[PDB]
């Protein structure tokens, strides 16, 4: 079985990877070499080689090319691909999948050869049982991404010839989701590439963009490097620079995921033609709102989106209601807004049409808009940790978790922790040395 956890997820989060210890050590290593102009990781080795040839007046040429760095191993560096291995990628992909009028998803990757997302993205969508995915990876040159062609084949992907700078090919046409991995890939120009992508992006689609932010320590460090290649430097931009860049192409930022050192992950949704939205209260306890909603959904001719908003009670289950309604005919109009605060001291934002928050969520236009404890977010599914739970216990018994295999033998908590069976004529005894007999081997062996 697929084991998951149903967790709340803020739309905008900061300091995602701060918990990781290895990433902090990597940042310390990279800044140490940067200081005064050391690890098995590729990026610290690259900086060590840059400092090695010259402590001063280093050739941009010599640091740029060096053995063990010609490979695109930077994306394999934990610092650069930290967020992708984090749950932020899964949350963004779930957000993209959820807000689709159809059950099929069309995703295209730009500069896929360097991005390498083609290997990682398709796996994360396997847990969705009904989702059907059509993946296509595009890179500037045919020889680019020539390696790993078997890795592409094992997944249901297609090659590409699109270079983002030029207008998108008609073959890609309209796609639900665009993934770039701009952190490692090189874009000719930010505004031009964004214009081309938004041209390729369908109406109401999503643009998932991964970038390193300028003005941050690691951002400045990468800015110093790759100075030989101007295109990569243009990819590195300020957070406000990216925010302004999105607006110019009329692309609205639905969500943002940021790392503690500076690596960030942008998610944007192409605006859809503004339509007057219906409003229906869904907090009535008598459930008489079903008839009112039943009538509205009946008029399938109307294309007005319908907003079910519950604000009276945090326990209202409108989330599942809209989840089930969307599948049924005429469900494309449904969109949810719920205010569920778990703390009384927390305040409730106003959802009046005049108020700003409702306008902002309408502009975002996401199906799920759940506000809890001062942050707009939506519930998401994450695979839970594989390791079995363990706790300190005074009572435990040796058990073979899998019959017939000795490698499984491990200590497990014992029912004696409760000691209810103890009674007069029976007593509990500590065990210092426990012997093994033939029958024990026969049992463990299976």
Q: Would you give the distance in Å from CA 78 to the centre of its chain?
A: 16
Give the residue from 120, 126, 49 showing the smallest Cα distance to 81.
120
Q: Return d(Cα 269, Cα 281) in angstroms, integer.
A: 27
CB 382 within 8 A of CB 4: yes
Alpha helices by DSSP H, 68-173: 82-85, 87-98, 112-115, 117-124, 149-154
Place of tokens 């069976």: 421
**Long-range pairs, 116-121, Cβ under 8 A, ≥24:** 116/72, 116/75, 116/181, 116/184, 117/84, 117/179, 117/181, 117/210, 118/151, 118/152, 118/155, 118/157, 119/148, 119/151, 119/155, 120/84, 120/89, 121/89, 121/93, 121/179
Q: Find, among 82, 89, 76, 90, the residue nearest to 18 by Cα.
A: 82
Give the whole-angstrom CA distance, residue 34 versus residue 225.
Answer: 10
Q: In whole angstroms, give the CA distance from residue 231 to residue 403.
A: 58
Question: Are residues 147 and 153 in contact, defined by beta-carbon separation less than 8 angstroms?
Answer: no
Residues 139 and 113: beta-carbon distance below 8 Å? yes
Report how far residue 350's alpha carbon sits from residue 14's, in angstroms, rounded to the nearest whole number: 25
User: Quick one: angle between helices 21-34 and 42-53, nearest 10?
Assistant: 10
Query: What is the phi/psi pair of residue 7, to 5°?
Result: -125, 145
Instruction: Return the number of other C-beta atoms located less than 10 Å from residue 50's C-beta.
Output: 22
**Pick from 244, 269, 293, 248: nearest CA to 360:** 269
Buried b (16+ CB within 10 A) or exposed e, 102-139: eeebbbbbbbbbbbbbbbebbebbeebeeeebebbbbb
> Cβ contacts of residue 15 below 8 Å, gap of 6+?
258, 259, 260
Say whether 184 sits in a helix, a strand or coil: coil
Interatomic CA distance for residues 221 and 33, integer angstroms = 10
Report the relative pairing of strands 370-371 and 334-339 from DSSP bridges: parallel
Instruction: Give me the resolution in angstroms, 1 decimal.
Output: 3.3
Report the SS3 class of residue 23.
helix
Report CA dihedral (187, 191, 194, 199) to the nearest 10 degrees: -130
Alpha carbon distance 74, 117 (integer Å): 14
d(CA 47, CA 65): 11
Q: Where are the alpha helices (DSSP H) in 288-389?
A: 289-298, 318-327, 356-364
162 vs 109: CA distance, rounded Å? 10
Method of structure determination: cryo-EM
């Amino acid at each position: 079985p697929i084991l998951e956890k149903f967790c709340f997820t803020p739309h905008t989060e900061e300091g995602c990877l701060s918990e990781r210890a290895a990433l902090q050590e990597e940042l310390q290593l990279c800044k140490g070499l940067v200081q005064a102009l050391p690890s098995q990781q590729e990026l610290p080795r690259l900086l060590s080689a840059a400092c090695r040839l010259q402590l001063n007046g280093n050739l941009q040429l010599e640091l740029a090319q060096v053995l063990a760095q010609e490979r695109p191993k930077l994306p394999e560096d934990p610092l650069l691909s930290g967020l992708l291995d984090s749950p932020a990628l899964k949350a963004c992909l779930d957000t993209a999948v959820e807000n689709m009028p159809s059950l099929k998803m069309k995703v295209v990757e730009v500069l896929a050869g360097h991005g390498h997302l083609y290997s990682r993205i398709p796996g994360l969508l396997s847990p969705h049982p009904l989702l059907q995915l059509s993946y296509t990876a595009t890179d500037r040159h045919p020889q680019a991404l020539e390696a790993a062609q078997a890795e592409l084949q094992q997944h249901d992907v297609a090659q590409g010839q699109w270079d983002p700078a030029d207008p998108a090919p008609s073959a890609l046409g309209s796609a639900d989701l665009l993934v770039c991995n701009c952190a490692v890939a090189a874009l000719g120009d930010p505004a031009s590439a964004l214009s081309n992508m938004v041209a390729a992006l369908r109406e109401g689609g999503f643009l998932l963009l991964h970038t390193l932010l300028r003005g941050h320590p690691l951002g400045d460090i990468v800015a110093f490097l790759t100075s030989t290649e101007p295109q990569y430097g243009q990819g590195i931009l300020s957070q406000d620079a990216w925010e302004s860049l999105f607006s110019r192409v009329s692309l609205r930022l639905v969500g943002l995921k940021k790392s503690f050192y500076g690596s960030t992950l942008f998610l944007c949704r192409r605006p859809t033609p503004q339509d007057s939205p219906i409003f229906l209260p869904v907090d009535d306890t008598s459930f008489r709102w079903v008839e009112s909603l039943k009538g509205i959904l009946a008029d399938e001719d109307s294309s007005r989106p319908v907003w079910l908003k519950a604000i009276n009670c945090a326990t209202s289950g409108v989330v599942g209601l809209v989840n089930c309604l969307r599948r049924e005919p005429g469900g494309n109009r449904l969109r949810c807004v719920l205010l569920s605060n778990l703390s009384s001291t927390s305040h409730v934002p106003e959802v009046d049409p005049g108020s700003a928050e409702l306008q902002k969520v309408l502009q975002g236009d996401l199906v799920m808009n759940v506000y809890r404890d001062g942050a707009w977010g939506a519930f998401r599914h994450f695979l839970l940790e594989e390791d079995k739970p363990e706790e300190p216990t005074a009572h435990a018994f040796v058990s073979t978790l899998t019959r017939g295999d000795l490698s499984s033998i491990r200590w497990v908590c014992s029912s004696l922790r409760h000691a209810q069976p103890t009674c007069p004529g029976a007593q509990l005894c500590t065990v210092y040395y426990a012997s093994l007999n033939f029958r024990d081997i026969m049992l463990a062996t299976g």
